[PDB]
């Protein structure tokens, strides 16, 4: 019975073994260079294998590092709060209000019904709705909400046969990929973008070119091209791309339209909470764009001479906190009080208060690798290197990030490589964004295994996909994504970000 | 129908009215001194009236202040993390593990059964158990858990008659008061202590005399004396204090002992999770005390020459994160995996992630009142004053804090007065602790109205108390608490804190 017991408690045994087996490195060295490497290896292993929760692992460098004589040092000019925390709080308020009233279901069903009834057009509508929802909501929640609806749609469309199996695989894969693809577009879409934004804001406080509007402007074309190419590739791989059929309704089309319509009525008539949430969401969609657009000069906002009147944090929370006071539900007296349309206990959830601890642990580990001699021990390997051109370094960095994120969680991968890429970016005397942006975009490209990211695991949990097919589709999707990211870096990101010219905010 | 509509939506109307009616102060002045006072008044009104959640109000100074031209300034030497955040995380892990397995119920029932069956001794046992539980758990949760048990106990003891009504009032009041009284003993007992600890750590980073062991050592005698005197006073007010009966069992005693025992079996036999949680809790009880005790020299811990080997944060989390990996519950396969005895989604709740935003808003408001001229406009009133002796300033400060906390939430009161008391403490050239400690202790003394603090509201929610009786008991309890706090400040806190001598960490 030992075999079953070992196979059950793999997590505890692996944690204990990983902790214990690296003790030779400190004990037979008694050197700070080895003692910091011990902590780095343990934390990296726990992050990549997911033995403990990511925040739990990130808390480790604050505890085991001081035991070795290495303690947090240096200082900061953080003052308090940030321009990013406020924007994040506002976006989370918006997402909570959208989710708790099931407005996202109405939006998704409306788009699916409106796009059309052609199966290729139906998959395109599913992908577009999922990406649009994942722009604001989280990838995990968006996928877990959209998947049941699509499963019902395919079950009732096929109820009117390997074709159904193939179509269901196609729609599962397209939803899984579109969640992440739409995550790239906005800063709040994915926790990886949150980690990159926080790290860049802390490490380069002078740099302020990174914000919601600029991020959307430089990420939207890449996401759109990737979405279209991925839809085409998925359609071609499973079904056949009938160009003539793309270009009088059959019985099947009428039946599927009826099914979609009756699901839409099953959602129910619109309510006051849904309409007020939609109005506030539309108001938030504006005043974020048209403030400082990259291409079109926007003078409607930020035309005031007063400083700080128009900024992302202000326009975010000044509207978001309205979700905490607008009367939604009243109430045999029932205390005769209304409902705030959002309760603070609901905002306590749905909020990235674990990415904060994660990036804090990343900072602690990076600062630990700034004293002693581990940093120099790693950097002396750069002496034989460094003759490689910048584009080549970009190529290896992007390929390594994409390869690692296939078998590791995206936040762990980004927090593991970003504090390594940044010093390398500053060493070669190149714009740090030139290195970080392709790597940050490619981190989310984890399109191969259910273990890669939660959306893929949720999609595979329905047990209607095979690993071989998922890998076959994801190889093409990842190749297309990497190609489009490289094309964007070479073509249009540089003029709007000045990637070729070294910046003033970067250190000498 | 206008009257009912107004009486229902008082919160929204009051928020709008408070925001709008103070616009004369900025508009007809156009002065930064008035524009900062406008924000201060609005935030203070929202904090004291609880129109919006406290964190929502604390977010306001980050939004409306920059609109007036006043922006966050200065810098900090925070580095990252703290010695307090790690300890708080460890204590919250311990509390979550205790609560989710219903160990606190077993502890409370065991103490109640063990203390005795005499009604005075029964109330003393209830008070002692509630205080001991509230030392680690939160006051709100401790009261909300203990109250049903005591209600059942009194209902079945009286089932074997105004005496039952009087005894039930007595036990309700004693639980309500003991929750807060036990909250004072430890730093993590009450959110007010968290706010004071965070503010003191940020404003005086050099000062390190404030930690778990020192806080317990200087707060335990005061809490114990207050508890004993409050028990005596509550017993005398409602029942009669029969000294002869204090000093052969009657039928009523046998019946109540049987009722307590059968409730104890109703709790159920002990489990593995409960025993492992108790073992880890006992281990955490040690190694916090006996590390650096105030009176008895403790050399069992902190005897290592290695720096940072023995500290509160390390001994807290090195044991707390064990709650995240110890196998509690296994699992027709059910994936054959164990349960970590704590899930990160459970630690996301039960955690003071709103006090962080609250103290951040307090810092933002205080820093706003450091530039322009509002600080000088308030401080020029100190020129006629300042001849008052230090003890007199203590007296007015403590009375004002106690009076305000009767009708306001304790965290709001402490975050409103602490950034005002600290500059006053530094101005008179006196130890800041001498001012802050009596005020911080007296802040929790809110023993009069259900609106004062959540434990009183929960106790009154059962509807077996009257406001007149609650006020009558709370006046005596508050007088006793204030007297004991003053006696402690005069007698034994000074030798262990050096309150009479100005400290080096305080600014010149
Ligand atoms: Na998302
Ligand atoms: Na408590």
Curated annotation (Swiss-Prot), chains A, B:
Source species, domain of life: Eukaryota
GO cellular component: apical plasma membrane; plasma membrane
GO molecular function: monoatomic anion:sodium symporter activity; sodium:sulfate symporter activity
InterPro entries listed in its UniProt record: Na/sul_symport_CS, SLC13A/DASS
Topology within the bilayer: Multi-pass membrane protein
UniProt subcellular location: Apical cell membrane
Record-stated family: Belongs to the SLC13A/DASS transporter (TC 2.A.47) family. NADC subfamily.
Function: Sodium:sulfate symporter that mediates sulfate reabsorption in the kidney and small intestine. Can also mediate the transport of selenate and thiosulfate.
Protein name per the record: Solute carrier family 13 member 1
